[PDB]
Structure 1
């Protein structure tokens, strides 16, 4: 416990009529590498910019000034980490008449005690009320969709009910490090209405969750490579979810009430050169009441894989058809019953490479009990917002001497904040980049909250030696136990840093509090950013930067005694430079992404690990992990060089079987109770050349398990890899058995 208090802060001291803490907290954020750090406002209350919030004044332009202010990344800008914005909305109804354009690196945040309403005016015109990627003449857009990172919308009512024609709440054409949190969509239930909650046509996501859709023709149109979605509720919709295409997604905790169709799944072809539909859906813990068809496919499957589905723990009350083909036959009859485990697609057992095409119940999926809440469902825990906490329950790191200016060594000031306040106050990292040169231990008991772009950047000799790797952030002491919640933080390095273990996670849940230790909207954005030493000017794809371009030793280390509930975390070794303009590719060296030795419980919900040399995920003597969806990519420069280079073999942190030519997406040794429910593991290059994408042979193997591990894979999608699944570095499941569009999919694998 911190030295300023006698027992832990365990609840807020706000009076219920007080505005949400974020409005009145001192606003001290800096954009460190902005052209004008001293004049550039990070926080913007929409009312300070003229918003009335009275339902009659058109507030579109006032809100837009709150977004736009400071000269930010708009038309003609690829990406930015240096022009952040927290757009804050106090209670009110804000009438808008054209799209609010949510620029690169913007968070829209409503009062969380009293959700503000965004009210579409009856003459609303435009693609959606909130627009994350505007279209320009010629079908250009502000941003490349696969590059459209850093965006959040939290705590709104979105009310389309005054629009008599079509209306869309959010054009959410986004990729990783984005979330939608705590939003209610109010839509017409009139016959023939054309209301749509979300329109999403492409992207490379992503996490979103905790939304309620009331009414509408379509709750969400979703088209995107991959996404994890937690705790959405669809009431009185025509189609809850109109899924138009994907490689593979995971849906957890879905509720569909009084809808015509729940999931409307567009089926496509099986070749990488044909029409792309929905490759894979993995749905776990769904409740469905008074709905005609729970899941409908656009077309039938004739005895081979052509669109994959996994269902786990589906509770149906008055749902005639569980799975059916559009104007085709019923595939699984419903009624009032609980579906335990059911799949459509190719099911595999052991080291036998034989597909069993399945449209039927499958062996019951093991769900280790430690991973399940007290209603028996995968734990579901939303981003903590501290709604009943008052501003004085927070302590500001800027107020305690941490400069956040990206230059001053902030190690001591930060260390001191933890020593004085851990467990005493919520620790508020005002926006900024905080340079540290020694381990920052976050003690068990701590709650940490950032402000859109609050970065801890480790640098210097403690972190440069791969033979002696050292932690930049330590989450709890070894053996420790307690609440640790981290929200809106970035953990990174200033290169070179070949010895950086960016996050070492030790803390375990206390007895009887599940997911009390976890991170939300918290990422490891490794290189590719302003003044990181790891940009295109230091690290060209030629490899000319050499030993300067070591970015880290390991991104995230989950240790033996730890538990972690990790939601949306992107462990991104930068493939390209976000800040120099041009999205230029760069070659950076990370030895590995995520290594877990944790005995559990570990929930990894829509985490991604990308561009590390030896593996994106390594589970070594781990137990009791629920992983879904997990997304990877191999570093673009491989096989030049081959793993482990430019590192050397390390027997503590590397797998026994090193990747041959290319990194493992996931490699598992001596582990049990591991459930991977939804995976997208990709390989797009051979030494910067894309030629291997067409013949689908960019790398040879990508997923390894040993002989003994107790691990199960469901909806395992890989891209451009010959062997999709290996036991003891020998290919077992060949891609040629599972083509499913652009990507290839294993519906189920189990040892037996």
Structure 2
């Protein structure tokens, strides 16, 4: 096939990792420049693998690395492969977006999967610790297993962590062989996700075999699979806009049986299970001692599917199909008339969860969604390269004025293109309310300087997105925001603009990465942990003030956005060793929004990871947090002073008279103050340490409190999982749901909180 003309294939390549010492390292690789023929006849395995591995990248024996990113581009074509495509650390596998190429497994293909994102060596050790396998894309492919015997074949071994995505992939598999068919689209053994969007699975035994701590996956279609989704294990998982068609089983979540369920919780929203034998197989019964197997259905059609939910241990139909299920919950519920203050285990349909119209797509009535833009129809001439227009991206030069001048002059038909590099910002950059910005494989935008962002008593925005009250169209994608040295006055992104329409203002694959990597000066040398002393709280190890602030009137659509304060060092010489980085606050949302967050995560801030203050119209699915591992050395009262301008939590006051005082002063996973119409569909809010000691896990008591609802906040929580917090949820100062009353297979889990 002809080249597609997609801008990405032809845009001038001027990028380079600023902190890789090799001036000739090449981030972009077109597989055909490595000898791939793309005709489906010549075996292209070696050429594709060489395009990935070229340049001394992070493969076997390399724990992790941020200075060897790669964007591996596959022009339109068919690529015959006979062994796995090994995706090295920090790789974007980018098929052509206009005409997604086919990865065609040879009949004699051998190996784990057509694409392997985390190989096992001969001794059974992964190349990368699964929970550290960050910063990846696979997008725009057809993966064809149909030449392989039905007894073998997996499309992608997707064993990954945060800031990863699968997008726009079709998996074509055989339908013959009965019980001996073993083909599957995704094979996922474990990990810590992550996002998937816009996938189609045709045939096979399983569309996907899934096992992971937590994941958000939406707009998935399954056609003629035996079981569409085999959920092997999880803590939580949120599915939205899933279409299952003519399968034997939709979601199998009964692994382990009624006395050993390995699936923690599943949420299924805005979905359709059509012409399928059994919609969902579960082993849950409300008399069981634990919360394993929790399930939420919200707005799910069951057309032509006579058994919507089946208890496959007893064989009993729990919910009849051939009707829409407005809402179903099984697991423990609190609040309202059903659960009350003590909580109650239930397995029942119930009344619809009504969401405000501002959060919905008016065309479908589903919660609004929009995938990461790839600008397929935009000509290369419309892209304005920052390096072509005066920004150096060298990680030292002050690029503030050059970037500001680009932002001030770019027209709405153009797109600002951040060539890969590291762009030092030394004072506030004002982003206008009409702009589109996209990056070459996660360029770094770093708050730097020696004064402007240094004062936590007088914090300042790094990127100020619109001015207060403005409406417009602002899109950013494929970028990382961070600090160069400590910048405890930096508000990394202040989001003032509101979209003209849903999805017109947002962030896709845009991450805030505070410390831990080359260029930050916040690495193992400077910030190594020392739990054996009282922490000095080194000034050289502070991070930012606040990673994201949606101010009153701001409205944003966030999808695949990781707000991460480093718990460990990311370059290979450090061997994943742990560090202390002191970052005040994660994500703060105020005002009437709306705000959507799909597949967001906020981890290791001191005061809170997510906070809603005087907020309305917030939809998050699913969310994930961690407390910083150094707490309580120091505890959450240090080193950021309480600032009422950000409604900061005041732990010295709030923990007064705590019955569990030793571990009370710890970062909030989620805090809501005077906020309503907030909807959280799935949450994994974890506390794994106390001053790097994990003894507290044995009694699920690393911290005292995890979610705080204050000022009669109406926060509608579904599939809330928390790890090792005595109290999962506290309302107006009273502990409501205790971990001990809601034990799952690892976390504790509340299916449904009625506010």
Deviation at 1:303, TM superposition (A): 4.7
Q: Is the 8 A contact 1:444 1:484 kept in 2?
A: yes
CA deviation map 1:175-203 (0-9, x unaligned): 10000000011111223332100000101
- Counterpart in the other structure of 1:263: 251
- Within the candidate set 59, 62, 78, 2:44 is matched to 59
What CA RMSD, in Å, does the superposition of the two structures yield over aligned residues? 1.6
CA deviation map 1:658-702 (0-9, x unaligned): 373201100001111111111110000001111111211100111
Residues 168 and 656 of structure 1, relative CA distance in 2, 3 Å threshold? closer
Q: Is the 8 A contact 1:352 1:732 kept in 2?
A: no
Select between 496-505 and 16-25 the one with higher mean Cα deviation. Answer: 16-25
CA deviation map 1:106-163 (0-9, x unaligned): 0001111111100001010000000000000221111000111011100001111111
CA deviation map 1:29-62 (0-9, x unaligned): 11111120x2000100000110000100000000
Matched residues in 2 for 1:327 and 1:27: separation?
58
Q: Is the 8 A contact 1:19 1:111 kept in 2?
A: no
Q: Please show how residues 518-537 of structure 1 align to structure 2 within 5 Å.
A: 518-537=506-525
- Counterpart in the other structure of 2:743: 739
Q: Does 1:316 align with 2:302?
A: yes
Q: Is the 8 A contact 1:245 1:266 kept in 2?
A: no
Residues 325 and 317 of structure 1, relative CA distance in 2, 3 Å threshold? same
Q: Does 1:395 align with 2:384?
A: yes
Deviation at 1:306, TM superposition (A): 3.2
- Counterpart in the other structure of 2:673: 669
- Counterpart in the other structure of 2:365: 376
- Counterpart in the other structure of 2:425: 436
Matched residues in 2 for 1:589 and 1:422: separation?
39
- Counterpart in the other structure of 1:558: 550
Matched residues in 2 for 1:63 and 1:354: separation?
58
Matched residues in 1 for 2:526 and 2:97: separation?
43
Q: Please show how residues 205-604 of structure 1 align to structure 2 within 5 Å.
A: 205-268=193-256, 277-298=262-283, 300=285, 302-304=287-289, 305-326=291-312, 328-349=314-335, 352-374=340-362, 375-460=364-449, 461-510=451-500, 513-542=501-530, 543-544=535-536, 546-579=538-571, 580-604=573-597
Q: Does 1:649 align with 2:649?
A: no
Q: Secondary structure at the match of 1:490?
A: strand
Matched residues in 2 for 1:585 and 1:377: separation?
42
Select between 115-124 and 721-730 the one with higher mean Cα deviation. Answer: 721-730
Residues 595 and 422 of structure 1, relative CA distance in 2, 3 Å threshold? farther
Deviation at 1:654, TM superposition (A): 3.7
Q: Does 1:639 align with 2:632?
A: yes
CA deviation map 1:388-419 (0-9, x unaligned): 11111111111112111111111111111111
Q: Does 1:33 align with 2:19?
A: yes
Q: Is the 8 A contact 2:524 2:574 kept in 1?
A: no
Matched residues in 2 for 1:586 and 1:433: separation?
22
- Within the candidate set 659, 668, 679, 2:683 is matched to 679
Matched residues in 2 for 1:306 and 1:143: separation?
29
Matched residues in 1 for 2:520 and 2:260: separation?
41
Matched residues in 2 for 1:547 and 1:583: separation?
22
- Counterpart in the other structure of 2:659: none
- Counterpart in the other structure of 2:657: none
Runs of at least 5 residues in structure 2 that lack an aligned partner in the other structure? 655-663
Matched residues in 1 for 2:323 and 2:75: separation?
44
Q: Is the 8 A contact 2:269 2:298 kept in 1?
A: yes
CA deviation map 1:587-627 (0-9, x unaligned): 01111100010312110111000000010011000000011
Matched residues in 2 for 1:18 and 1:269: separation?
50
Deviation at 1:330, TM superposition (A): 2.8
Q: Secondary structure at the match of 1:88?
A: strand
CA deviation map 1:216-245 (0-9, x unaligned): 110000100000011110010001001010
Residues 538 and 654 of structure 1, relative CA distance in 2, 3 Å threshold? farther
Matched residues in 2 for 1:545 and 1:167: separation?
51
- Within the candidate set 94, 103, 113, 1:109 is matched to 94
Q: Is the 8 A contact 2:112 2:157 kept in 1?
A: yes
Q: Is the 8 A contact 1:422 1:447 kept in 2?
A: no
Residues 548 and 43 of structure 1, relative CA distance in 2, 3 Å threshold? same
CA deviation map 1:481-527 (0-9, x unaligned): 111111101011112101010111111011xx211101111100111
Q: Secondary structure at the match of 1:402?
A: coil
Q: Is the 8 A contact 1:320 1:333 kept in 2?
A: no
Q: Is the 8 A contact 2:326 2:351 kept in 1?
A: no
Q: Is the 8 A contact 1:685 1:693 kept in 2?
A: yes
Larger RCO: Structure 1 or Structure 2 (Cα < 8 Å, ≥ 6 residues apart)? 1
Matched residues in 1 for 2:581 and 2:485: separation?
10
Matched residues in 2 for 1:327 and 1:663: separation?
41
Q: Is the 8 A contact 2:285 2:347 kept in 1?
A: no
Normalising by structure 2, we get a TM-score of 0.95
Q: Secondary structure at the match of 1:294?
A: strand
Deviation at 1:548, TM superposition (A): 1.1
Matched residues in 1 for 2:585 and 2:13: separation?
37
CA deviation map 1:236-278 (0-9, x unaligned): 00010010101111111110000000100134599xxx95600
Residues 131 and 18 of structure 1, relative CA distance in 2, 3 Å threshold? closer
Normalising by structure 1, we get a TM-score of 0.95
Q: Does 1:629 align with 2:622?
A: yes
Q: Does 1:74 align with 2:64?
A: no
- Counterpart in the other structure of 1:123: 108
Select between 237-246 and 275-284 the one with higher mean Cα deviation. Answer: 275-284
Q: Is the 8 A contact 2:257 2:313 kept in 1?
A: no
- Within the candidate set 620, 640, 645, 2:613 is matched to 620
Matched residues in 2 for 1:267 and 1:366: separation?
32
Q: Secondary structure at the match of 1:722?
A: strand
Matched residues in 2 for 1:656 and 1:647: separation?
11
Q: Secondary structure at the match of 1:210?
A: strand
CA deviation map 1:285-310 (0-9, x unaligned): 11111001111025655355332000
